Nucleic acid binder design. Structure first.
Ligand SMILES: Nc1nc2cc[nH]c2c(=O)[nH]1
Lengths: 324, 381
RNA sequence: CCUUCGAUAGCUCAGUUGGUAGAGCGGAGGACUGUACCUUAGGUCGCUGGUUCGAAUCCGGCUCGAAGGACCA
């Protein structure tokens, strides 16, 4: 399997470059929400030497995804020649060629193609949706074969269809035949058993030479169910939600606690015993409780370090679990 | 005759600027030195390793701020402030008083102490000098401060404040039995006038407290009368005792106060450059790919640029706020190192001319107070 | 080919009982001189045409759509 380092506008949330160097287990590929990279495309259009040197992380590979999974979107707002991106920029009329200019400026290693048909959030309308989602991939493959560094960049395909069985089946079948690097599963936001066996059939319909991705699914038990149903890569927007509400994850990978209860203000133990993050290494849980009481900006950083360390350690554990 | 905590091997010729070493129970601090406030450092999210990486040696604390929460008894149980915010070096605790929190949030002042309150309505207490020194014994710091009567403010109220500070220093000395584990400083009051201030200086030079501190100045301070008070105070005191100063953070204020003999000085999003303050919210150099200062050894310049933090400043706000604030503290530390290194090279008139012309363009554009004080101490620009 | 609905700050939307515009997420200016943030700009409300003193609000049509039967599978 695998995970993507969830970055909001270049760097990790509440983490600087030195503090990212403090985190253990950061992947070599970093997710970039394309919505936060609207004006960044202009800056990189007249920066002209890549985004890795721009943000200060050129040694890592990059991935661009259109949807920030913290703000995924409604039951349907996407169009079938454009994808609106939830975040800070890219609503009206984002063409495939606009995406071509964006990926030329960013120069990502991988990039997610566009999509339509969010109704899973009947037959013939899903046929139209799937045909348009193939029109996107055809346009991307036509406009990708031109430039050499863009020829070094890799298309990732999108599977659509909705809750319908046969239409998403034929979406997988007729989207597989294109010469594409990888695949995405879309419209699977929470979870029901209907989408579960739809996933089970559709990932069985796709060839086994390509990676599978998904959006809007990061809670660990749905991660385990999608791993056993056929998804390779996941986003990491769940520990951001854990830290945003002021909680800290506690489940042993190898659930969570709200520190605003008064019972932990005497303990000298860290949040997780034996945790190798910075917060558990030096600080105590009483101080985290204390600074959450006064609502300052430091416990967000310490907790955010702890949640990333725990959550990427969970991904390390599930990579090693299927390895054995 | 207490042993002196300060030693000096540095004497400028054209000026009276000084540079020396202070021994404290967690290390040695080079005078002059700047001190980031611990409340705003904890508020702006710089961790322990990021603040220690710049080379800082003194941080700051308050009696009130830990007394309200998490409680003096919990802090005393854990030997709090050095194992709590995890500051491995020495720290100076401000005793507090009539700060920006005042009678809109304070309470009645009686002889025994000053009553402190909280948004917690049941948390109202009476901060007595014995109470304050008990709390500051519970904090376990390295330089404790006697309880102050801060004024901005002129009149007989300042005379009452300085007399009451003399009496409260007597109460503080007679209260605690730690003259050797921790060092107690004495706040010299006097407001904006020099006669009651002068007899106050005489009064606690009769007292044998190891440290002296000028207080009650910043907030409504005019810089000419400021440097005049600093000069007369530093002339009055013996040269083997340190002179803490309050509320000095700007660069020219700091360096000219070093020229007069000081040794201590002490919302994010604005960087500090050798040409001054550079607010990084500016869209005027949002396309600049150079570092903030090409000579600054802070990690922000050497790894990042200006365009990247311009993008990051409000999007993921916490990380860019961290970057900006650690750059500011690194700049202040490098400025102190430059001033001390120039003074040890006996180049300080030339150095003050040099950076004066650097961050002011020419001697004609400089403020009158810096030129006036440097000419008075004996340095021409 | 037909039926219903959407297009609003850079982004999500409210506002649709018609009053040209707000909230949040994002930007910009300042203050940070011993700490229980302030101020401010930006959006021809997709296009075309119409009613009306007046549209974002209502609509014929176009583009980009979404749902559904699909002129075609
Ligand atoms: N120690 C100390 N701090 C402050 C902060 C404002 N005024 C003062 C003062 O006079 N003394």
């Amino acid at each position: 399997p695998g995970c993507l380092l969830y970055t909001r506008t270049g760097s990790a949330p509440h983490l600087t470059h030195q503090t990212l160097r403090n985190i253990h287990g950061v992947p070599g590929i970093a997710q970039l929400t394309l919505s936060s990279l609207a004006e960044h495309h202009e800056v990189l259009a007249e920066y002209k030497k890549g985004v890795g040197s721009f943000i200060g992380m050129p040694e890592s590979l990059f991935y661009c995804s259109l949807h920030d999974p913290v703000t995924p979107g409604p039951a349907g707002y996407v169009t079938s020649k454009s994808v609106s991106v939830w975040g800070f920029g890219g609503r009206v009329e984002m063409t495939v060629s606009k995406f071509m200019a964006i990926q030329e400026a960013l120069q990502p290693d991988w990039f997610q193609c566009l999509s339509d048909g969010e109704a899973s959030c009947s037959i013939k309308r899903a046929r139209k949706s799937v045909d348009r989602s193939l029109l996107f991939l055809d346009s991307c493959l036509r406009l990708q074969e031109e430039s050499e560094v863009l020829q070094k960049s890799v298309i990732i395909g999108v599977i659509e269809g909705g809750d319908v069985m046969e239409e998403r089946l034929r979406s997988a079948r007729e989207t597989a035949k294109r010469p594409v690097g990888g695949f995405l599963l879309d419209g699977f936001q929470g979870v029901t058993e209907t989408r579960l066996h739809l996933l089970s059939s559709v990932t069985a319909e796709l060839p086994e030479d390509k990676p599978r991705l998904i959006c809007g699914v990061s809670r660990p038990d749905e991660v385990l169910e999608c791993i056993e149903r056929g998804v390779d890569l996941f986003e990491s927007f769940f520990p951001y939600q854990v830290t945003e509400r002021g909680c800290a994850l506690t489940f042993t990978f190898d659930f969570e606690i709200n520190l605003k209860e008064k019972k932990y203000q005497e303990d000298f133990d860290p949040l997780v015993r034996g945790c190798s993050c910075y917060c558990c290494k030096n600080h105590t849980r009483a101080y985290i409780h204390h600074l959450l009481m006064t609502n300052e900006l430091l416990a967000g950083v310490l907790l955010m370090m702890h949640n990333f360390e725990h959550y990427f350690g969970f991904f390390c554990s599930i990579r090693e679990a299927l390895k054995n | 005759s207490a042993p002196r905590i300060m030693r000096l091997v540095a004497e400028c010729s054209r000026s009276g600027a000084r540079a020396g070493e202070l021994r404290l129970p967690h290390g040695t601090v080079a005078t002059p030195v700047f001190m980031p406030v611990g409340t705003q450092a904890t508020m702006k999210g710089i961790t322990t390793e990021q603040l220690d990486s710049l080379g800082c040696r003194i941080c700051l604390g308050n009696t009130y701020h830990l007394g309200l929460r998490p409680g003096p008894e919990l802090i005393r149980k854990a030997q709090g402030l050095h194992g709590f915010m995890n500051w491995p070096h020495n720290l100076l605790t401000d005793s507090g008083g009539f700060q920006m929190v005042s009678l809109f949030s304070l309470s009645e002042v009686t002889e025994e102490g000053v009553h402190f309150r909280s948004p917690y309505d049941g948390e109202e207490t009476l901060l007595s000098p014995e109470r304050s020194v008990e709390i500051q014994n519970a904090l376990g710091s390295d330089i404790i401060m006697q309880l102050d009567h801060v004024v901005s403010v002129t009149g007989p109220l300042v005379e009452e404040a300085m007399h009451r500070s003399v009496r409260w220093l007597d109460r503080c000395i007679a209260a605690h039995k730690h003259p050797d584990k921790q060092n107690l400083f004495a706040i010299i009051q006097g407001g904006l006038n020099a006669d009651l201030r002068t007899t106050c200086l005489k009064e606690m030079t009769k007292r044998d407290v190891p440290g002296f501190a000028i207080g009650g100045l910043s907030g409504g301070e005019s810089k000419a009368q400021f440097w005049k008070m600093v000069a007369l105070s530093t002339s009055m005191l013996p040269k083997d005792k340190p002179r803490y100063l309050m509320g000095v953070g700007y660069a020219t204020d700091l360096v000219v106060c070093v020229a007069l003999g000081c040794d201590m000085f002490d919302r994010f999003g604005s960087a500090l450059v050798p040409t001054g303050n550079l607010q990084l919210k500016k869209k005027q150099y949002a396309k600049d790919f150079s570092p903030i200062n090409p000579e600054c050894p802070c990690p922000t310049c050497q790894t990042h640029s200006r365009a990247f933090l311009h993008a990051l400043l409000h999007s993921d706000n916490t990380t860019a706020l961290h970057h900006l604030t650690v750059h500011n503290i690194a700049y202040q530390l490098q400025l102190l190192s430059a001033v001390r290194s120039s003074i040890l090279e006996q180049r300080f008139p030339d150095f003050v001319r040099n950076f004066m012309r650097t961050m002011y363009g020419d001697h004609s554009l400089c403020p009158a107070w810096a030129v006036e004080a440097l000419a008075s101490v004996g340095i021409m620009l």
